[PDB]
Design an enzyme around this catalytic site. Structure first.
Site, PDB file in Angstrom:
ATOM      1  N   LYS A 247      23.919  57.391  -9.543  1.00 23.78           N
ATOM      2  CA  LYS A 247      24.329  56.146  -8.896  1.00 23.78           C
ATOM      3  C   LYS A 247      23.612  55.893  -7.570  1.00 23.78           C
ATOM      4  CE  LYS A 247      28.430  57.721  -9.397  1.00 23.78           C
ATOM      5  NZ  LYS A 247      29.866  57.801  -9.045  1.00 23.78           N
TER       6      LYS A 247
ATOM      7  N   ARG B 182      37.489  53.227  -9.074  1.00 28.63           N
ATOM      8  CA  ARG B 182      37.482  54.592  -9.581  1.00 28.63           C
ATOM      9  C   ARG B 182      38.741  54.933 -10.374  1.00 28.63           C
ATOM     10  NH1 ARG B 182      33.974  59.119  -7.635  1.00 28.63           N
ATOM     11  NH2 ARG B 182      33.045  57.528  -6.267  1.00 28.63           N
TER      12      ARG B 182
ATOM     13  N   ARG C 257      21.109  69.452  -5.217  1.00 32.41           N
ATOM     14  CA  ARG C 257      21.000  68.276  -4.349  1.00 32.41           C
ATOM     15  C   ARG C 257      20.939  68.570  -2.841  1.00 32.41           C
ATOM     16  NH1 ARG C 257      25.045  63.108  -4.796  1.00 32.41           N
ATOM     17  NH2 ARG C 257      26.657  64.742  -4.715  1.00 32.41           N
TER      18      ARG C 257
ATOM     19  N   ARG D 271      25.777  68.558   0.713  1.00 31.78           N
ATOM     20  CA  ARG D 271      27.095  67.929   0.849  1.00 31.78           C
ATOM     21  C   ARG D 271      28.214  68.965   0.725  1.00 31.78           C
ATOM     22  NH1 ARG D 271      27.741  62.409  -2.687  1.00 31.78           N
ATOM     23  NH2 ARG D 271      29.747  63.398  -3.183  1.00 31.78           N
TER      24      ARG D 271
ATOM     25  N   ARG E 213      36.045  67.528  -9.710  1.00 34.03           N
ATOM     26  CA  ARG E 213      35.483  66.175  -9.717  1.00 34.03           C
ATOM     27  C   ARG E 213      35.184  65.647 -11.125  1.00 34.03           C
ATOM     28  NH1 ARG E 213      30.606  66.889  -5.704  1.00 34.03           N
ATOM     29  NH2 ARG E 213      30.097  64.722  -6.245  1.00 34.03           N
TER      30      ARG E 213
HETATM   31  N1  AP5 Z   1      17.493  60.770 -13.683  1.00 38.67           N
HETATM   32  C1  AP5 Z   1      17.495  61.887 -12.933  1.00 38.67           C
HETATM   33  N2  AP5 Z   1      16.929  63.046 -13.335  1.00 38.67           N
HETATM   34  C2  AP5 Z   1      16.928  64.103 -12.527  1.00 38.67           C
HETATM   35  N3  AP5 Z   1      17.444  64.241 -11.318  1.00 38.67           N
HETATM   36  C3  AP5 Z   1      18.097  63.109 -10.948  1.00 38.67           C
HETATM   37  C4  AP5 Z   1      18.135  61.910 -11.702  1.00 38.67           C
HETATM   38  N4  AP5 Z   1      18.849  60.956 -11.006  1.00 38.67           N
HETATM   39  C5  AP5 Z   1      19.257  61.542  -9.926  1.00 38.67           C
HETATM   40  N5  AP5 Z   1      18.873  62.854  -9.845  1.00 38.67           N
HETATM   41  C6  AP5 Z   1      19.368  63.793  -8.844  1.00 38.67           C
HETATM   42  O1  AP5 Z   1      20.552  64.520  -9.109  1.00 38.67           O
HETATM   43  C7  AP5 Z   1      21.359  64.520  -7.933  1.00 38.67           C
HETATM   44  C8  AP5 Z   1      22.500  63.485  -8.054  1.00 38.67           C
HETATM   45  O2  AP5 Z   1      22.102  62.118  -7.987  1.00 38.67           O
HETATM   46  P1  AP5 Z   1      22.761  61.142  -7.030  1.00 38.67           P
HETATM   47  O3  AP5 Z   1      22.156  59.802  -7.271  1.00 38.67           O
HETATM   48  O4  AP5 Z   1      22.645  61.740  -5.702  1.00 38.67           O
HETATM   49  O5  AP5 Z   1      24.218  61.153  -7.487  1.00 38.67           O
HETATM   50  P2  AP5 Z   1      25.423  60.298  -7.791  1.00 38.67           P
HETATM   51  O6  AP5 Z   1      25.416  59.860  -9.175  1.00 38.67           O
HETATM   52  O7  AP5 Z   1      25.431  59.223  -6.773  1.00 38.67           O
HETATM   53  O8  AP5 Z   1      26.635  61.187  -7.542  1.00 38.67           O
HETATM   54  P3  AP5 Z   1      27.704  61.529  -6.469  1.00 38.67           P
HETATM   55  O9  AP5 Z   1      27.983  62.980  -6.541  1.00 38.67           O
HETATM   56  O10 AP5 Z   1      27.264  61.002  -5.185  1.00 38.67           O
HETATM   57  O11 AP5 Z   1      28.953  60.752  -6.892  1.00 38.67           O
HETATM   58  P4  AP5 Z   1      30.452  60.728  -6.640  1.00 38.67           P
HETATM   59  O12 AP5 Z   1      31.047  59.549  -7.307  1.00 38.67           O
HETATM   60  O13 AP5 Z   1      31.017  62.027  -7.008  1.00 38.67           O
HETATM   61  O14 AP5 Z   1      30.504  60.581  -5.147  1.00 38.67           O
HETATM   62  P5  AP5 Z   1      30.933  59.650  -4.015  1.00 38.67           P
HETATM   63  O15 AP5 Z   1      30.172  60.011  -2.817  1.00 38.67           O
HETATM   64  O16 AP5 Z   1      30.920  58.255  -4.521  1.00 38.67           O
HETATM   65  O17 AP5 Z   1      32.357  60.020  -3.779  1.00 38.67           O
HETATM   66  C9  AP5 Z   1      32.741  61.265  -3.125  1.00 38.67           C
HETATM   67  C10 AP5 Z   1      34.268  61.469  -2.983  1.00 38.67           C
HETATM   68  O18 AP5 Z   1      34.855  60.425  -2.163  1.00 38.67           O
HETATM   69  C11 AP5 Z   1      36.027  59.955  -2.858  1.00 38.67           C
HETATM   70  N6  AP5 Z   1      36.027  58.553  -3.235  1.00 38.67           N
HETATM   71  C12 AP5 Z   1      34.941  57.711  -3.202  1.00 38.67           C
HETATM   72  N7  AP5 Z   1      35.217  56.533  -3.678  1.00 38.67           N
HETATM   73  C13 AP5 Z   1      36.542  56.563  -4.049  1.00 38.67           C
HETATM   74  C14 AP5 Z   1      37.401  55.626  -4.603  1.00 38.67           C
HETATM   75  N8  AP5 Z   1      36.979  54.394  -4.917  1.00 38.67           N
HETATM   76  N9  AP5 Z   1      38.672  56.001  -4.805  1.00 38.67           N
HETATM   77  C15 AP5 Z   1      39.049  57.234  -4.520  1.00 38.67           C
HETATM   78  N10 AP5 Z   1      38.341  58.215  -3.989  1.00 38.67           N
HETATM   79  C16 AP5 Z   1      37.068  57.841  -3.759  1.00 38.67           C
HETATM   80  C17 AP5 Z   1      36.499  61.039  -3.822  1.00 38.67           C
HETATM   81  O19 AP5 Z   1      37.093  62.138  -3.137  1.00 38.67           O
HETATM   82  C18 AP5 Z   1      35.064  61.377  -4.286  1.00 38.67           C
HETATM   83  O20 AP5 Z   1      34.943  62.550  -5.130  1.00 38.67           O
HETATM   84  C19 AP5 Z   1      20.368  64.385  -6.736  1.00 38.67           C
HETATM   85  O21 AP5 Z   1      19.792  65.656  -6.437  1.00 38.67           O
HETATM   86  C20 AP5 Z   1      19.307  63.462  -7.351  1.00 38.67           C
HETATM   87  O22 AP5 Z   1      17.989  63.623  -6.816  1.00 38.67           O
END
Ligand code: AP5
Length: 218
Positions: free
Chosen positions: A15, A91, A130, A163, A174
């Site tokens: 994402k 979410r 990451r 992170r 997660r």
């Molecule tokens: N095609 C490919 N091939 C190979 N390598 C690749 C690739 N694409 C990417 N990569 C790589 O692989 C890795 C991952 O890609 P990357 O693009 O970094 O990952 P991502 O998909 O964005 O994943 P996240 O871990 O950031 O998502 P999340 O939803 O858990 O986190 P968020 O911060 O929103 O949320 C964090 C926390 O906040 C909270 N939170 C946030 N929003 C809400 C909500 N709406 N309601 C409730 N709690 C919430 C919860 O506690 C939550 O867990 C990197 O190393 C990258 O280089």
């Protein structure tokens, strides 16, 4: 030249890697609820310190807090008039229903919900390797997507960090939370007719072309 969309996917699906592409192409506001929470943590605010504990355990922050945050950004942030990319919100089903209501009242309904589909076994390797540039959100990957200057932002020099919620313990929680609480939202958008699925196990440039294709622009 304008898009209102949601990006849905499990932790590590890509994402944060794809959202810049979309933000450049359509000049939309990138609203990422994870980044918003992390800025609260960096400010040392009380919401930030409470959220940090929940995030590091692999849990979800309350729907009430998250809905209020998005409501204010949609209302008071001028860039959201051009269109927006919601990243990590909604979410849960309650968040999805409240978003639907909000947009109905504003007269700006969602155009697309893109699901990044990728198998859990692949996601562990992605999260484990990451490194993020904490001053922007730039994510790199040790093996798959390296910093050329190691542990440093290739384009801004500064050091990359890990992170605090990116470990196997938190990651197991997660993934379970994603399947239990977030994945049901995909059926909600299938029934409304705006869902499109994308193979997120492919490399980044391939996934980006797939997304452009699914959006009906290219
Ligand atoms: N095609 C490919 N091939 C190979 N390598 C690749 C690739 N694409 C990417 N990569 C790589 O692989 C890795 C991952 O890609 P990357 O693009 O970094 O990952 P991502 O998909 O964005 O994943 P996240 O871990 O950031 O998502 P999340 O939803 O858990 O986190 P968020 O911060 O929103 O949320 C964090 C926390 O906040 C909270 N939170 C946030 N929003 C809400 C909500 N709406 N309601 C409730 N709690 C919430 C919860 O506690 C939550 O867990 C990197 O190393 C990258 O280089």
């Amino acid at each position: 030249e304008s898009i209102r969309m949601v990006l849905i996917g499990p932790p590590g699906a890509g994402k944060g890697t794809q959202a810049p592409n979309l933000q450049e192409r359509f000049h939309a506001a990138h609203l990422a609820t994870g980044d918003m929470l992390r800025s609260q943590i960096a400010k040392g605010t009380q919401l930030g310190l409470e959220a940090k504990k929940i995030m590091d355990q692999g849990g979800l922050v309350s729907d009430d807090i998250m809905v209020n945050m998005i409501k204010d950004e949609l209302t008071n942030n001028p860039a959201c008039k051009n269109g927006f990319i919601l990243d990590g919100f909604p979410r849960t089903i309650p968040q999805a229903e409240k978003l639907d209501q909000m947009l109905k009242e504003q007269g700006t309904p969602l155009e697309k919900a893109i699901e990044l589909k990728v198998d859990d076994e692949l996601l562990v390797a992605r999260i484990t390797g990451r490194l993020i540039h904490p001053a922007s959100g730039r994510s790199y990957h040790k093996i798959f997507n390296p910093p050329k200057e190691d542990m440093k932002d290739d384009v801004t020099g500064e050091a990359l960090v890990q992170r605090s919620d990116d470990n196997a313990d938190a990651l197991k929680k997660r993934l379970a939370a994603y399947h239990a609480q977030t994945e049901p939202i995909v059926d909600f958008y299938k029934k409304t007719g705006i869902w499109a699925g994308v193979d997120a196990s492919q490399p980044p440039a391939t996934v980006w072309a797939d997304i452009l294709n699914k959006l009906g622009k290219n």
